[PDB]
């Protein structure tokens, strides 16, 4: 995915999918949006997927859950991303009283 | 007190880099230089510099003299034509003007 973003073709890789295949790519993006080692590539393929397959979310319902279940982790990823910078200032506190 | 050396190196121009007779030397025409390489070892055996001077003038074309080898017809943008000989440098100081508005190509 990083090579396919370095070459300008990630849209080309995603734009011709089918229903079960796009469910699979949503499933992988949902599973691995949590890790901060590749949250960037994961949110990039998530952006392109929402842009490229948002019209048949009513035509099929099993895809509709996977878009919603992508939210549920995103709604839970922001909280851990929120608390991490709460501690991020909390650890900044002791590193200034040490001097 | 300071001094500036002569230009060396250069850009390899888009004219076809020509072969010699008997396949042993390759004569490559840069801009403001034309130099001949020994092929088996990849080493320049001669570098015939060419003075250019009129802002954007370039070596337009170059070829061997098809009558007699070891002679190069070289032609620049403004109409100057050199009849130099590789394995020496006889002819750099003596170009010949052709009295032209602008030269676009040549063929011997």
């Amino acid at each position: 995915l990083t090579a396919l973003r370095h070459r300008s073709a990630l849209r080309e890789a995603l734009q011709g999918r089918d229903e079960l295949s796009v469910i699979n790519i949503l499933r992988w993006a949902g599973k691995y949006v949590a890790d901060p080692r590749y949250r960037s590539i994961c949110v990039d393929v998530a952006f392109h997927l929402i842009d490229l397959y948002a019209e048949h979310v009513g035509g099929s319902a099993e895809l509709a859950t996977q878009f919603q279940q992508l939210l549920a982790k995103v709604n839970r990823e922001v909280e851990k991303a929120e608390l991490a910078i709460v501690t991020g200032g909390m650890v900044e506190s002791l590193m200034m009283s040490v001097e | 007190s300071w001094k500036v050396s002569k230009p060396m190196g250069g850009r390899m121009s888009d004219i076809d880099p020509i072969f010699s007779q008997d396949e042993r030397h390759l004569i490559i025409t840069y801009n403001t230089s034309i130099q001949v390489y020994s092929t088996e070892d990849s080493l320049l055996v001669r570098r015939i510099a060419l003075p250019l001077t009129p802002s954007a003038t370039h070596i337009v074309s170059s070829a061997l003299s098809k009558s007699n080898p070891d002679y190069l017809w070289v032609a620049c943008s403004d109409g100057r034509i050199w009849h130099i000989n590789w394995t020496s440098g006889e002819g750099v100081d003596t170009p010949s003007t052709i009295d032209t508005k602008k030269l676009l190509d040549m063929a011997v």
Binding site: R5, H6, R7, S8 | K3, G9, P17, F19, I28
Partner: protein
């Protein structure tokens, strides 16, 4: 539209000719029998055979000797061979760059390629290895003949342009060698719109032959040079590269951002495509060991050097001239000193399989900088010539200020301000003075704390403003800057000014027929070398 063409004679009488016109749409037309079709009011119908493989304009097409093979070469970096008796092709796919010119020897055995990255190779046929190789300086060139594929209104029309100064160092402990940044080809470098130079080549200064080549960023000479849409792919550019004091260590930075036509789908509110690219900037900082075969080896690669809520760009880096330590200043506001140590996790050192211990560079010191914002900043740094003290110019518009920091300890020894009229361009440090250049140039001593030399430069375009730069000798106390005489185009004139440290009279002024791209200082002796866009190199010296 005719790009190139080669004719071949059907023979001491001339019975016929057979021409191959390589047309810039990517086609190769073969006209079979022209003289027998045009000797005879009326003419019989002619119909050129179409061979279409390339995508961009073919740069050269030639028949090979006995006329069985129609060989060709274009921008896709591949020497194709049309079999022309059967219907097959067979090809040498992975050169360095675009196939600019080809020829065949009088005997049919040797091919000869002029490669776009300043090179030439004599190949033996069916050996297909370069029996002879010659490479030059490979800088950015403003070519007189503009381009063979700029004729048909492509998506990005390739322009004869210079954007940025050449990233080039003269290496100590072998001053005749010069490390400098080159892309894959000249055309492939300037194509796409942005400079894309992920290669370092080493070039010999005594005898101007390009010694060797190596890759810094990621680079795929085995992949397709173009995307499916038609845009040339852009690689990470090596922005800053400075050399150690030992001659054995090397620090590089590469920057890369996706295209603004690529993003198209991350824009939510007031976010433009340029904003999306500048947010998805990727930047690596890489520490390399230099082996005496001029071999570059990685030891360290930091992904987030100057990091805040998003990634921040790195402005400059410089080596301490006494110890092995690289300072970097960036868009965050802090200045970071990196030093090498040995990998030792728990007393268990990890070694090379030969036995030598692995070293790794890491952040030695962190120095936050003071900021004074009155009512898009830049950076620059330079060590002293004696070490222990580092000058750091921080560069908001007109208000911009220098800070001199001790290196033994993270305390600030000095801060001066009011010394810049515009945005900073760069800064060096002589024996006691700082030579800074912004829209104005100032030589300023710090031992007396006084502006020795001041200069207002003539107002010029933004390209020339980015194109000026200076370099200092450090052996004979003399600096020299480089400026083109006033958007950039082909025929321009430039002049450089070698000053001395003490006076205001430039000891040498020389205008040049082409605009100069790089100025560097040989460390072993006095003087400088200079690289000019009509890519020629020459040396200036005292005596």
């Amino acid at each position: 539209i005719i790009s190139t063409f080669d004719i071949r004679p059907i023979i001491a009488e001339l019975q016929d000719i057979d021409v191959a016109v390589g047309g810039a749409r990517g086609a190769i037309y073969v006209y079979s029998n022209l003289l027998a079709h045009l000797h005879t009011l009326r003419v019989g119908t002619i119909q050129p055979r179409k061979y279409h493989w390339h995508r961009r304009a073919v740069h050269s097409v030639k028949w090979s000797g006995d006329g069985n093979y129609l060989i060709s070469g274009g921008y896709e970096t591949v020497l194709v061979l049309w079999q022309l008796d059967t219907g097959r092709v067979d090809f040498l796919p992975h050169l360095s760059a675009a196939i600019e010119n080809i020829v065949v020897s009088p005997k049919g055995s040797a091919y000869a390629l002029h490669l776009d990255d300043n090179s030439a190779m004599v190949l033996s046929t069916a050996e297909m290895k370069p029996s002879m190789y010659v490479s030059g300086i490979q800088s950015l060139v403003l070519g007189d003949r503009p381009s063979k594929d700029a004729l048909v209104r492509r998506v990005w029309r390739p322009i004869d342009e210079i954007a940025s100064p050449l990233v080039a160092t003269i290496s100590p402990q072998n001053p005749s060698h010069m490390f400098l940044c080159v892309g894959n080809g000249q055309q492939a470098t300037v194509g796409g719109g942005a400079t894309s130079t992920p290669l370092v080549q080493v070039f010999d200064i005594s005898s101007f032959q390009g010694v060797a080549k190596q890759a810094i960023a990621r680079t795929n000479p085995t992949d397709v040079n173009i995307t499916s849409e038609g845009v040339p792919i852009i690689e990470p550019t090596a922005t800053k590269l400075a050399f150690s004091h030992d001659g054995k260590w090397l620090a590089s930075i590469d920057e890369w951002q996706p295209p603004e036509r690529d993003t198209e789908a991350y824009l939510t509110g007031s976010k433009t495509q340029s904003d999306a690219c500048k947010e998805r900037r990727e930047i690596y900082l890489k520490f390399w060991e230099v082996g005496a075969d001029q071999s570059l080896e990685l030891v360290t690669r930091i992904n987030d050097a100057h990091y805040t809520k998003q990634t921040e760009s790195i402005f400059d880096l410089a080596s301490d001239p006494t110890s092995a330590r690289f300072a970097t200043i960036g868009n965050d506001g802090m200045v970071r000193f990196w030093s090498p140590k040995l990998r030792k996790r728990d007393g268990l050192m990890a070694t090379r399989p030969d036995g030598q211990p692995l070293r790794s560079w890491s952040c030695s010191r962190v120095v936050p900088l003071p900021v004074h914002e009155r009512q898009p900043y830049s950076g620059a740094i330079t060590f002293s010539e004696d070490g222990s003290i580092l000058f750091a110019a921080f560069g908001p518009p007109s208000g911009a200020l220098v800070v001199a920091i001790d290196t033994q300890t993270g305390t600030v020894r000095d801060v001066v301000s009011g010394m810049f009229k515009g945005d900073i361009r760069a800064m060096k440090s002589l024996s006691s003075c700082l030579i800074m250049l912004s829209d104005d140039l100032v030589v300023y001593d710090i031992v007396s704390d006084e502006m020795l030399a001041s200069y207002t430069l003539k107002e010029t375009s933004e390209a020339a403003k980015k194109l000026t730069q200076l370099a200092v000798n450090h052996q004979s106390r003399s600096f020299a800057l480089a400026a083109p005489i006033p958007k950039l185009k082909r025929g321009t004139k430039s002049e450089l000014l070698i000053f001395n440290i003490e006076d205001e009279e430039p000891k040498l002024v020389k205008t040049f027929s082409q605009v100069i791209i790089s100025v560097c200082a040989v460390p072993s002796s006095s003087g400088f070398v200079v690289v000019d866009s009509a890519a020629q190199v020459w040396s200036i010296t005292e005596g």
